[PDB]
Structures are given as structure tokens and as C-alpha cells.
Amino acid sequence: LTFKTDLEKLEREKAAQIGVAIVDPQGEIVAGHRMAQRFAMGSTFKFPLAALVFERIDSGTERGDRKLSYGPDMIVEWSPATERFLASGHMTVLEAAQAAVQLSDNGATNLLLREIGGPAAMTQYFRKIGDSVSRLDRKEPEMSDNTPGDLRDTTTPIAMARTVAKVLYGGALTSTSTHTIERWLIGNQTGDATLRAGFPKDWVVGEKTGTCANGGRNDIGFFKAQERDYAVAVYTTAPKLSAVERDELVASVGQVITQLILST
């Protein structure tokens, strides 16, 4: 079946909605499905947050090894690294960013939000890099609440895919910072069952997951199919599936993407 009809089959059979955008390195459209529907970002915003931090490192307005001190008040739902570093009393800017990206650590994310000026500063960065759509309104985990219809804390697949491409391929960061964030995405610890489970094993893949209440399951990042680079954003809503079934839904989207790319 076509890309569109195979996604529609998943939607119908799983009682789900699937938002997908694939763009080339310059943000030119390759494929999409519900690509301009808004979906709750959940933790997918942590990748753009890390990019914001690297832009500040590149400009000299932040220093990666600067120590960010905190107390037990910064431990929130799912803060595995922040909990381990708590007794020491700090994480560096870079430790926190890497934990946010690779573990989806919420405390580490909020520690960075404290330093940059909160959700308003995240939104300002999206605007700066040409994304007029994505918006961070709240810190974690409440930003992942995904109340039906709420436009707070949302993006669209196409806006987010274009943001990913800007960061990885469009010169938003220096070559060193770009390579570092790319490696963080490849080494993500939370995506083994989602998109990259649906891609060929020789593709170079890096991504950042999200999970939202009310059935949100998301995965954004890049893949390089031999020499060809792509940015991808997948947002799904499936209120009646189990958590494992939602992982499998996203992996299935990965397969549908692959069938398209291999068509070619």
C-alpha cells in the first residue's frame, strides 16, 4: 500500500491518529501525514532545549562545564540522573543536557529551564530558528499532560521536523556542537522500542522520544539511509492502546517510512 494508506490503516485499526513529517536537510518536504495537526510535544522538546543550550555555548553566553547547584526540590517524576547527582549538589550544564536528551530526565530538564529563563526562553529560541509554531508553556512533567484540545506545549510534525533539520543540517550550531548533539541522539537510551526499531539496522538513526498522558507517544530525530540524510518527526495519539502497543505503533510508523524510502 502507499505511505498514506498504510498510515490510515494503522490509524483505523488502532483507533489512533498519526502525525508524520519527513524533510531533507534543507527542510524541503519529503513526506507527511497530518503534518500540520498540532500534537503535545511531551519530552521531545528536550532536543530543541539542548540545541538552545549549545547555541549559548557557541556564543559564549553559557559554559558547558558550569556547575548548576540544586536541592531535593528539583527532583520530579522521572529524574534518574538528577537523583544520582543530588548528594554531590550539582550537575553541569552539559551533564544536565545530556541526561535530558538521553534519559528524558525531567529534573535535569527543569534545571536547565531554571537557568535559561523558563518556558518563555524556550519558545523564543524556536522563533529565533524560524519555528513560529512550536511552543513551550510549562515545565515537566505538567507540560506532558496533553489535555485534549489544549494548544499549550504543542508543535506540528512539519514544524518540528524543520526545527530538527535546522539544528542538525541547517547551521544553527557550530560543527562541534552539531556533532555532539547528533551523537547524543544516536546514543539515546529511551528509543530502542520506538522509531529506530522500525528502521533498517544499517541506517544511522538518532532520536528523542516523548510520552504524554491521554495516549501521546512521539519520536523525533534523523536518519541517514546510506548517504541520504533526513529529519523526521512522529507524533501519535492512541488513547486506548497500552504503553507497549504505542511503542509498537511508532515502530510500525518507522516501517512505513522505510517502505517509502526504499521504494525509493
Q: Coil, strand or helix: which one is 157?
A: helix
249 contacts 255 by C-beta, under 8 angstroms: no
Show me where the domains of the chain are located. 1-264
Please give the C-alpha separations between residue 1 and each of 9, 43, 107, in angstroms, as whole numbers.
10, 32, 43
CB atoms within 10 A of CB 240: 9
Q: What is the resolution of this structure in A?
A: 1.0
Name every residue whose Cβ is closer than 8 Å to that of residue 24 and which is 6 or more positions away in sequence.
30, 165, 229, 230, 231
Q: Coil, strand or helix: which one is 231?
A: strand
> What is the number of alpha carbons within 13 Å of residue 129 lying toward its C-beta?
29
CB atoms within 10 A of CB 187: 12
Given CATH 3.40.710.10, say whether it is the number of domain 1-264: yes
* CA 161 to chain CA mean position, Å: 10
Q: What are phi and psi of 91, to 5 degrees?
A: -125, 150
The residue annotated as part of the active site, out of 43, 104, 134, 144, is 43
Please indicate whether residue 43 is annotated as part of the active site.
yes
How many Å apart are CA 153 and CA 248, to the nearest integer?
24
Method by which the coordinates were obtained = X-ray
